[PDB]
Structures are given as structure tokens and as C-alpha cells.
């Protein structure tokens, strides 16, 4: 048998944390130490998360009504002796343990989407007096560097950097900022324009060559396209070697195509060929890309087989039956690949997307009500 | 604020050296409240060699409150002089990490990893 001992006072510093298989693998990895880290914005209010170098878990405390004792083996200074009575089902004691902790709760860990804390970071639209406007704000405290941002965000380093690149994060005059859609697209256009004019390798762009190409023949005082702006644009529309960037050309073409949809066929339809003409005409001269209407799936619909018109998902109903109804009213017959991105967000319970469509629609391969 | 989890000590002990972990720890669970005296110091003076209910370990007065007997998955717990509880050794679906939160330096150290627990969820029985 095992002798059970208890201290008169437990240490509440000992706590139970749920270890997911991945968390367990990380913790049980002798190769590296300090791979997991508790992070919080503040001590008294904000949530605490557990982060590796590329993943984030949210902590949740859960109280229970049972007695849970954390006990450890100890070597008695003196032999533990007591008179044995009529104890049956009890063998001779061979071991002593002492309850050193008494927990009333567990700390559960749930995998969660790491996110950036974008509280104090302003939006940059390419103004020339941006430094002044920020300096004349109510909140003087400004996030200086990206390291500070990641440090004070509920996310891992890799998640943070990825999101920062995805949202067009940048820095102007020493203050971190987020480029507006307008300025992002303008900076992209200027970058592409300059890239063609200097015959830069679109598969191997760097910050210095691109920035120099952009600000070569313009005054510094009137040039908002700094090295950081260029680097941001590259980190948004290109992919860097794990050294140099290569443009995501179909993605760029898609962006221009969405803009084109919003500009030319908003509220009105138009032959696909002519729209292709306008779309292509939006690009900087000699820019290498082959456009196709399929790039714009989820951003358009076809009133007729030879016409195209813009549609925003935000204007669609949130109830499945109604959304399918209005989509089918706008267009009687759909191609299978065209309606999916318009209705995917409504699949909350999770199933096969084809079956999901089957519930409200039928094939005949095109799609009908 | 932010701080890394230190698992170096646990790692070293794990590499070196029943349900008891190699580090010599276990988790006991009882569906109820373990009623112990509020004053160990007073009762330790009345403790007779026959009873052996109290002892001193590393400057702490420990009470011997029961006995545990493990038979495979089955487990039996004797509490006090008059209680017997039947329970089981169950494998945790989600392994539990025991961590020590040092408030002084705001440092966290991995103490151990619990994969099993000895649980008693049924009403206590007479000693025989």
C-alpha cells in the first residue's frame, strides 16, 4: 500500500495546465528550451495566451467541485510506524507520498487564431503632412517598432509577421501605420510602373533597386514611396525567398480586376470582352499578365452567358435559402465554381460543400434552384 | 508582460532516473471534501506511536490521512480509521502539465506531466 500524507498548507503556485498533443511534443522536446511563452498586454485586465514561435493558444480556467491533490513521493526522516488494525485489501506500506498541492480548477488550452493588437496604429493614406497629424492626436503614445507591436499582441511571432504583411502594415516617420486600400493600390501601381521602366526582374525584386527605380527622378520632399513603403508593397503582393521578392502576378491581376469590376460594372452589366479590355487597360504598360474572368470568381455574376456584373457578398442575405433564392433570381443558371465563394460563409455546421449546394440547389454541369 | 516556460529541470530529471511518474508524483481525485483537522500542531502533540498520524518532514508537520492500494486499474482508498472508498486508475484523455508560477520573478517552471489519475467518485464504505 501507499501511505498518504498531507501538509497543513498547500502552495497555490502549482497549477494544472492542459497539454494538447502538440503542446506536449513541444514541452517534451530536449532539443530546445523556452519554446513556449505566456503573453499578455497587461497584468490585470487582458487575456493571457500561450505562444510558440508560430502558434497561439488561448487559456481558459475551469473550476470543479472535486478534491484534487497533487502528491509527491518523499523520504521520511523517521520510519512511518503505526499500529495495524483489521485492514483488509491493504498490503504493507512501501511508499510515502505527500499532497503538496490542492487544485480546484484546471487551465485548459485551446488552439486559437493569433491576432495583432492594432489599437494605437493609425491609417496612412499617403499624406505629406502625416507626421504632423499624428503628432496632433489625443493619444501621444505611438508604437515605434514592429517588435513592440508583436510583443504587445496576442499572437506568435510568425503569425504576427504574416498578418502584418497581409494587412499592408508599414512605418512612416518612425510611427507604425497601416496603408489605406487607396494608397496601397496606388503604391503598387507606381511600383509596377517603375519596375517596367527600369526592366527590373519581376521574379527577383529587392527593396533598394525598386525604391531607387521609383524615386530616381522625383524630389525627395514630394516622394512618399520610401523604402519601408516599397517593402510593405512587396510583402503584400510578392513572396520573399527564405532574400528577394517575386511578384504574385495572378493575385495582382485579380486585385486590378476587382477594382475594374467596382469601377465599370457596378449596378450595370457589360459584355465580357469589353470588360476584359477595360481591365487590361487599367494595368501599367507592358505589364506581363494574362487576365481571365475566372480570377474574379466571388466578385461577379453573369446575367447572360456573354455579360458580367459586379456583386458584393456584403449585400447578400445571411439566411441560406434567401441567398440562394436571390442569387438564382439574379442569374437563373450558374456554373458550379461560380457560386461557391458566394455561399461558403454560410456553411456553419460544416459538411460537404457540394451537399450544401444540393440542399438548396440541383445540378442539371450547371446549377439550378 | 511576457515570460518563457522553463522545462530544463524537468527535462534533466526525465532523462535521468505504477502510475507514479519517474519524477515521483501522482494525482488523486475524490468526489467529495477531504476533512482534515484545522490545527495540526495541537493534535501532533497528542499523537501516540500507536496512531502514527503525524510526523515532521523538512520542517513541515504532515498528517497521515490514509492509505492507497493499487490493483491494476482498480484502486482502493482507506481514509481515517473508518472509511473505505473504491475507485479506479484512469488514463487522462488530456495530459496535465504541473507548473510552478514563481510570483517573485514572474517565472514559470515545468514541474511534471500527469498522464494518469487515481479517482474515487463513489460513496465511502465501512472498513469491511
Amino acid at each position: 500500500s501507499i501511505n498518504l500524507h498531507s501538509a497543513p498548507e498547500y502552495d497555490p503556485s502549482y497549477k494544472l495546465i492542459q497539454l494538447t498533443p502538440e503542446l506536449l511534443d513541444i514541452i517534451q522536446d530536449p532539443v530546445q528550451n523556452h519554446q513556449l511563452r505566456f503573453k499578455s498586454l497587461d497584468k490585470d485586465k487582458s487575456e493571457v495566451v500561450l505562444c510558440s514561435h508560430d502558434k497561439t493558444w488561448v487559456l481558459k480556467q475551469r473550476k470543479h467541485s472535486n478534491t484534487v491533490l497533487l502528491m509527491r513521493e518523499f523520504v521520511p526522516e523517521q520510519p512511518i510506524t503505526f499500529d495495524e488494525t483489521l485492514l483488509f485489501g491493504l498490503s504493507k506500506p512501501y511508499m510515502d507520498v505527500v499532497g503538496f498541492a490542492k487544485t480546484e480548477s484546471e487551465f485548459e488550452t485551446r488552439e486559437t487564431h493569433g491576432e495583432l493588437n492594432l489599437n494605437s496604429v493609425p491609417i496612412y493614406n499617403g499624406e505629406l503632412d502625416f507626421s504632423d497629424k499624428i503628432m496632433k492626436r489625443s493619444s501621444t503614445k505611438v508604437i515605434g517598432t514592429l517588435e513592440e507591436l508583436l510583443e504587445n499582441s496576442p499572437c506568435s511571432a510568425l503569425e504576427g509577421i504574416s498578418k502584418w504583411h497581409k494587412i499592408g502594415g508599414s512605418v512612416k516617420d518612425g510611427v507604425l501605420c497601416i496603408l489605406s486600400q487607396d494608397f496601397l493600390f496606388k503604391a503598387l501601381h507606381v511600383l509596377l510602373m517603375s519596375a517596367m521602366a527600369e526592366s527590373l526582374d519581376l521574379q527577383h525584386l529587392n527593396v533598394e533597386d525598386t525604391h531607387h527605380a521609383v524615386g530616381k527622378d522625383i524630389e525627395d520632399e514630394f516622394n512618399p514611396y520610401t523604402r519601408e513603403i516599397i517593402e510593405t508593397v512587396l510583402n503584400k503582393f510578392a513572396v520573399q525567398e527564405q532574400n528577394t521578392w517575386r511578384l504574385r502576378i495572378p493575385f495582382i491581376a485579380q486585385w486590378y480586376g476587382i477594382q475594374a469590376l467596382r469601377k465599370y460594372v457596378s449596378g450595370i452589366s457589360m459584355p465580357i470582352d469589353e470588360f476584359l479590355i477595360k481591365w487590361k487597360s487599367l494595368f501599367p504598360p507592358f505589364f506581363p499578365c494574362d487576365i481571365d474572368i475566372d480570377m474574379l470568381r466571388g466578385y461577379h455574376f453573369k446575367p447572360t452567358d456573354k455579360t458580367v456584373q459586379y456583386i458584393a457578398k456584403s449585400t447578400l442575405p445571411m439566411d441560406p435559402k434567401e441567398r440562394f433564392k436571390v442569387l438564382f433570381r439574379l442569374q437563373s443558371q450558374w456554373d458550379l465554381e461560380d457560386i461557391k465563394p458566394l455561399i461558403e460563409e454560410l456553411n456553419s455546421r460544416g459538411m460537404k460543400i457540394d451537399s450544401f449546394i444540393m440542399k438548396y440547389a440541383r445540378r442539371k454541369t450547371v446549377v439550378t434552384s | 508582460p511576457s515570460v518563457d516556460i522553463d522545462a530544463s529541470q524537468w527535462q534533466k530529471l526525465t532523462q535521468s532516473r505504477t502510475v507514479i511518474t519517474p519524477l515521483g508524483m501522482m494525482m488523486l481525485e475524490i468526489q467529495g471534501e477531504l476533512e482534515l483537522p484545522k490545527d495540526f500542531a495541537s493534535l501532533a502533540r497528542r499523537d501516540s506511536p500507536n496512531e502514527g498520524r503525524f510526523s515532521e518532514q523538512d520542517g513541515e508537520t504532515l498528517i497521515r490521512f490514509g492509505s492507497l492500494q493499487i490493483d491494476g486499474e482498480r484502486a482502493t482508498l482507506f481514509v481515517g480509521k473508518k472509511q473505505r472508498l473504491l475507485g479506479k486508475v484512469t488514463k487522462l484523455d488530456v495530459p496535465m502539465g504541473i507548473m510552478h508560477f514563481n510570483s517573485k520573478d514572474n517565472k514559470v517552471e515545468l514541474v511534471d506531466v500527469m498522464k494518469y489519475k487515481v479517482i474515487f467518485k463513489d460513496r465511502p464504505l465501512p472498513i469491511m
Partner: peptide
């Protein structure tokens, strides 16, 4: 005489999960 025993809880209850702050870990 020393009195040691278990007050049996008829069942088991789990409270609602709660958020965790920095002070919750380091009390």
C-alpha cells in the same frame, strides 16, 4: 482523538470556463 474522513459529494459540477489574466497565474 484525531478525526479524518471524506464528506462525499453526491455528484460532480463543472463551473463555466473563465478568461485568464496575468495576475490569475501569478497570485
Amino acid at each position: 482523538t484525531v478525526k479524518i474522513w471524506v464528506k462525499y459529494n453526491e455528484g460532480f459540477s463543472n463551473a463555466v470556463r473563465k478568461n485568464v489574466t496575468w495576475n490569475n497565474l501569478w497570485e
